[PDB]
């Protein structure tokens, strides 16, 4: 059964990861990282050679929905016990007074000795980028604690009200402000500003502030979460719908000597590097480049098509735009010939194999931007935007994409000549949280078929040593794999319980700072990222 194999992994998990450094009165905390050969914690190395083992609760947000799903499913709830306790402990022991958690790209607690750690000096500050934290999970353990984290998480990153200028950063330790009563002032596009409003965190605001709604009735949640996620559709562009990855430019409070240096308040870094050659449309809000387009078209996407469904009539809106933009992204970006999307500004200008001129934060000058393939994840967003919108341009990229990854040929339509690859060694969750969503929709059961394929694929070829890897040579397992997930998934749909496992919305979690190498120098920005892409025998480079 998948559902065993998903029993056996949660269970390695709670052996291997768990609080080995406190004798028989543990912690309920996990390692985010653990070798399968050893059991060794991957730890993060501070600047005077002391080692911490990595316990980040932001970056264990698909191992609660893992646990929680597993409990429904196996009818066993020891997992969702666990899963409770970890939260309450979060709430009890690393909660500020301000509402925010000891977790996020700065700050993680050391399963050693258990305090709060700071990985990066200058950034010993709360942040989330694409985090999606289980909040239905929190809500039940201790719902004041988590509508205390999500209303000090909207008053630390929100930097004037009246504007709504946010940021990817907050202070820990500030008192509350008018937070919701705040009386707010619409801005015209792309208004100068020093927080920078990226989409990453603005996706877990808009997110948290909706979930806060959704479990309290919060009006004022509401109201300021439709707003900011409004904020992001008032800049696209008049003609081609594009963009946007923020909504303000950057405050210039100081010229600038070095194009290398790309600190933000020398002014919007788009148009440092671009605008001599493209012209005020170079704004960092509308740079569609790799990586952007993925918080845009992939985790803003599937977390406002799951938002404006659940608001029903007054969620219409978020629907059509948010459907509306992965029709631009389709119809300017995407090339069917070879599956990839083109680099662009949101005005339409292709940037596909333009030479950067000069250096900036986009590259060293003669890099050079390439078309990059369409990934898995952006199946799951085409998938689920034609559920919404039976457009055939939304189902060209979903075929395009399954068939430039194995699939096949998932039809000229739902249900019509549909030629999947039931020999596929496909092993990707992505595509198979996608095919279970293509299945949803349209009841075609090759869809699911194929689906179980991959499924079996990942368990044949990712189920190593009891944990999941992308690779048999990775030398650390990543708790958080969503692997089990889309085997959790699948068997929620095989089983007509779909509810039973929690939405898939492609989140995640980092940890960011200086990592000391062996010659006791400073390797500034690394993230555990990095340490997981290792490979045994490997290190990290200066
Ligand atoms: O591969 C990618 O391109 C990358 O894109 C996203 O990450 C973005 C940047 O690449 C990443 O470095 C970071 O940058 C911001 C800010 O733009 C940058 O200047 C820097 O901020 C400095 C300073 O480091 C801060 O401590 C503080 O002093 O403010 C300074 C400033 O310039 O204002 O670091 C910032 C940050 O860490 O947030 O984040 C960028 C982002 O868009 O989030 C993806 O997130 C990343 O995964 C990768 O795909």
Redesign the pocket.
Known sequence: DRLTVVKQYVDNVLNKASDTYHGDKPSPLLADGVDPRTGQQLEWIFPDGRRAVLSNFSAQQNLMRVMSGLSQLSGDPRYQKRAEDIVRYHFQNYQDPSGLLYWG?HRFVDLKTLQPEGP?E??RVH?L??AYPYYDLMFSVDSDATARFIRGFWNAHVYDWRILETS??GEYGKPMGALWESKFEQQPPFFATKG?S?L??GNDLIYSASLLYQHQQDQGALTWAKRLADQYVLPRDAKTGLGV?QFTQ?LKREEPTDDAD????FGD?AQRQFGPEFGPAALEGNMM????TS?LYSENALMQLQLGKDLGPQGQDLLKWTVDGLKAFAKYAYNDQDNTFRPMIANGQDLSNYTLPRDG??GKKGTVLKPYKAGNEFLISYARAYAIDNDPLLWKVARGIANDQGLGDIGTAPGKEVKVNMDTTNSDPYALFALLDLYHASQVADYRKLAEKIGDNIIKTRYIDGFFMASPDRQYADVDAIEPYALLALEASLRNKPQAVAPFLNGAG?T?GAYRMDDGSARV?T?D?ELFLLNVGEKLQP
């Open positions: 790209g990066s200058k950034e942040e980028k694409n990817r950063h920078l990226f990453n965190a990855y950057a790309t600190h933000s308040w870094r480049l790799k990586g952007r918080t934060y986009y980092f960011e920005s993230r990222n």
